[PDB]
Here is the input.
Amino acid sequence: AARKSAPA
Amino acid sequence: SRLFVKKTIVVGNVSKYIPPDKREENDQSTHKWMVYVRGSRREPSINHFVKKVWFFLHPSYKPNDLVEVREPPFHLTRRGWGEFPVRVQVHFKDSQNKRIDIIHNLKLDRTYTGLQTLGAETVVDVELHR
Here is the structure.
């Protein structure tokens, strides 16, 4: 899976 | 023979911080979050091929740690204090397409404004028999 996450 | 189509499935979550004056008594939850299962913006709605979605939650949510959603939107809203890996199990209308598990790491808001913020998205391609 390709994951992307906001730092805050 | 052995024809397939690829379709995008996006598991994501949003959340918002809950200030102390808006918290239920003896709920330690600091956030309201929602996990969603959607398609890409460039493709047809996933309702055409997704039968149902199971959300497996951290055991702190027992006895309600397995939640089935059969109709769109495939959303799940809960209050909580902790991040954990959400297991999302997608079941397809066509029996020829086996279920898939997607692990989504829940990301909770750290702005603490009380406004909703985008947490994370986990993107997978799936294979549908044609």
Observations:
- The beta strands of chain B are 4-17, 31-39, 50-56, 66-69, 74-80, 85-92, 100-105, 117-129.
- The interface with chain A takes residues 102-103, 105, 107, 109-111, 117-124 of chain B (CB under 8 Å).
